[PDB]
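Form 12-C: Joint structure prediction
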Amino acid sequence: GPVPSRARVYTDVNTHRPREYWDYESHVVEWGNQDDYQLVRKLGRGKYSEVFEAINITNNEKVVVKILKPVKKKKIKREIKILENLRGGPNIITLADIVKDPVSRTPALVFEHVNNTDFKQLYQTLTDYDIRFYMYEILKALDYCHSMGIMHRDVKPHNVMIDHEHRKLRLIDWGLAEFYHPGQEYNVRVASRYFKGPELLVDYQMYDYSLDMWSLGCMLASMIFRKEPFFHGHDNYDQLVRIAKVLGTEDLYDYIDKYNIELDPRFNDILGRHSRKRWERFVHSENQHLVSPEALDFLDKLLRYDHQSRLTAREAMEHPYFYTVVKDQA
Amino acid sequence: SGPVPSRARVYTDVNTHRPREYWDYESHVVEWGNQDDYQLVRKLGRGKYSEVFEAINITNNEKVVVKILKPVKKKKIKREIKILENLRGGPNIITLADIVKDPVSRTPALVFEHVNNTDFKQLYQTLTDYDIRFYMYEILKALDYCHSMGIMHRDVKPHNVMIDHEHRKLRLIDWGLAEFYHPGQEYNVRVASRYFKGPELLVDYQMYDYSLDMWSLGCMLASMIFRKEPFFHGHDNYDQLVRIAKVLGTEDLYDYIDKYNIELDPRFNDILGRHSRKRWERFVHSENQHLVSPEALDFLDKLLRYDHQSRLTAREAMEHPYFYTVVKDQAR
Amino acid sequence: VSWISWFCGLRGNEFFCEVDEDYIQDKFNLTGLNEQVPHYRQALDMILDLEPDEELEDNPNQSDLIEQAAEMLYGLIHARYILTNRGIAQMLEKYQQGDFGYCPRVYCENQPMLPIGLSDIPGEAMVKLYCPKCMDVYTPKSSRHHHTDGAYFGTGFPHILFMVHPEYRPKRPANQFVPRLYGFKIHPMAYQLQLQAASNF
Amino acid sequence: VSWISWFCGLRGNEFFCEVDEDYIQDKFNLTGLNEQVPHYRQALDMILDLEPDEELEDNPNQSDLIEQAAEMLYGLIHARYILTNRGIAQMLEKYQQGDFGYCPRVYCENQPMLPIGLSDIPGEAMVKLYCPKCMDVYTPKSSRHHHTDGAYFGTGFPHILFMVHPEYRPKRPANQFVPRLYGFKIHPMAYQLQLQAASNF
Ligand SMILES: Nc1ncnc2c1ncn2[C@@H]1O[C@H](COP(=O)(O)OP(=O)(O)CP(=O)(O)O)[C@@H](O)[C@H]1O
Ligand SMILES: Nc1ncnc2c1ncn2[C@@H]1O[C@H](COP(=O)(O)OP(=O)(O)CP(=O)(O)O)[C@@H](O)[C@H]1O
Ligand SMILES: [Mg+2]
Ligand SMILES: [Mg+2]
Ligand SMILES: [Mg+2]
Ligand SMILES: [Mg+2]
Ligand SMILES: [Zn+2]
Ligand SMILES: [Zn+2]
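Section 2 - Result
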């Protein structure tokens, strides 16, 4: 079969910690008073939940309410445990209270409110230093959850809140987040299509924290090259082809043969042969002010087929791309 | 030969010299104020001619009584509205504040001052002797004014005199049947309450004067000091006179008829019969004993007379032993 | 079969009450209506159970300009009549039966309503229904009453009814409608934001 | 003739909208209903245009406990469906046609209403109607809709509709009912006195 793979950093964290941590199924919920919340405005909604802007009438502050539908009785326990374990962490969204409808038993999460200047009209207004700054903020958060033995598995611009007014960044949406157990296999139907790691596209169930680092790379590329999304695919097949046309087909088969991955026959029929293009190719007169030799080098070490050969969150923070940022913390 | 003419003893020629913009209410115009200043609160009463409401003038937040006049007669409305203005400011006379109207239906409405009336349904059985002497003197104080102004009330009844015992306040209302007095001129005999109808109204004598109110005042006095409301309890305009004839006697009745050659209706003398004049001391028992005095009976005896010309005037009535304790208590 | 009993018994005229005998016979209560309704005596004698024009060509022709002009008269008379103590007592009796209907509002709990006109002027508005519990006017349920002038009932009929009968004033609703979305209340700011969004087309 | 189109085409079911094909075919949206409706697969396959039990087809002990148990299922499915963006769009289209009716209140001026349930629990309350202008619930005009569970529409359907579509929120009424008796307004003290008089029996 396939060749086993384990995480380089924070490999054994859940395999020594008390079971009242990585075992979210045996966890219980501290259900608070729901009547303290009144809906005001719909911020968004999706397949799993509806999200509202609400006002906590007890303190007259603005609170965001996330209403979880009865999807899976263990998935709800997963996000609620992770949110509490990462609670108080750097750039991690704050779970305030966990209420539920006494009639329908449908639970609802409430969070702190971040006046998000939406990135639909923000990523085209960011400068070079701004991109370097917020990227360092995500790493500051990604390194924490990875150290806590928790993968995010859904790193996307639609799941990172930015209040440019106060230079505030928060990472949200921890529904797809999961604890990391070494050797144990996971599901490959996670994360956004445009941010799916190569391991998820070739059905490699034994991934680790490095999955988020790929998603982070796609974000960086989409920002510094002004192309959202960068790897614009149409399915889980065309997606890898989109990647193969950039990273080359040369290193792809090397990634497969290294782990003896049982590749789906439909791939090699449509993969063809693509040479590895330079990162200096996607640079034009618009994104030129965002691209630097350090930026390309950092991105080049982020987007790799081999998850084991990708930069870790701490390693990524120790990069020339984040020199102007760290030195400005005096 | 028809009936014998009759003229008023006091204030005989008042309207026959005054400017015509006084007794002629038909050529009068109305100062219609803003109606939106009034909001209804509670129904105080209503009758054949009008509806009466308790309202709050939202401009000054005071209590105001609204009388809504229905389109009865386009001259009757002009009559009460002129009299109320002519007697406005008078002693114990109700005060016409404003005269509004519905801009849609053109139905006028009168507003008056509010008098917290401790209703006489449960008051006339609580009054003492001095109280009766006091308020009766107050009515005379008002009746003498309108009579001096050449205005008959023609509707003097307990239901038309407001009494606020709290502040010893008395006001005379309901001036719809009120009419200016012209000497010699004939009027209508279908006025005033049945129990307070003067003998002249019951025998169809169209030429009456201010003295009509003095009879009605006598009926009030009798009903109060004898504790019998009403005193002359009749069933029609025929039995009413019979009720009176059984007390004042049939002797002085025919004398009143023959004096003025009144064309008496044939049905009367058939049912009148013969009744002797009973004493006023006959209607006195253990209940009304504290209200009856020799001065009270003497005053009442001079009030209730068949001959209107021989009845006490309002000023003459005030100069009576019955009102000695009252007048002397104004030395302040 | 009389005229008054026939008219009030018709379909769509369940709101109407039968006017007493002497109220129309008393000409004191009918003044000011001469130059207000066409063919006054024709409209009067027809509803008063009197013979029609004895010699003038009895053939009705289009008495829709006469018979439905007699309906106009009785309608206006009915307006003056239901303000009187006798008229109110009759309406109050129909009120106890529920001839006028019940309040559409859920939290009024089927409170029986009274008929009411928005205007005292004929041909300006149709008859409405007044709930004494919520104190607002409603459009009649059935389509029957959608063709009846509100001027035939007046604007102050239900108002004057509780003036003389304050004991019939219903206790104000013990409950009210509270918006619940997924178990949550709705802050009033939500409705303010929606109105601002609505003013953008 | 399908099942969904037939049921929604029935009289008294004008409030219902036809649920899309794949929404019921997607078993992700039907969870938690197994021990909530009797004969689950019977209720499911019947409305999904599938063949019967294959054999004992004659109504399995009076299919009024099966067919009207299939009505129970689709009703609950309709509640979850009209909260989705697709479901709302369908109801919003019916809203434009006025399939639900207009507000009984006069000063709402025939504002089209939305269906609403007072409770999300079946057999506790019937379907009501929500006017977005006066923001109160009313009892349906016709007697047809007086036999339809409110749990089949939910308590937060009209609320969540204007959450995603705030542009459809009507401007609050420009006019209101003002009591007029003989041209006079009525002071609020009047209603207070009547309530005190009413509390004396
Ligand atoms: N703290 C906050 N301040 C302002 N908005 C917030 C917020 N927290 C969350 N949001 C809102 O949450 C929305 C995203 O919701 P969320 O990602 O939790 O839904 P979801 O995870 O169920 C759908 P999917 O999994 O497909 O991404 C964002 O559009 C944002 O507007
Ligand atoms: N100033 C006042 N303060 C309190 N109540 C007053 C008032 N003025 C009038 N009222 C009310 O007016 C009612 C009488 O109304 P009014 O006498 O004017 O009707 P009316 O004359 O049309 C009927 P009728 O001629 O048969 O007596 C009394 O019951 C009294 O309660
Ligand atoms: Mg999300
Ligand atoms: Mg999510
Ligand atoms: Mg009076
Ligand atoms: Mg009077
Ligand atoms: Zn009501
Ligand atoms: Zn409405």
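Section 3 - Comments
Chain A has eleven helices and nine strands. Residues A 158-159, 173 surround magnesium ion (ligand 3) (CB under 6 Å).
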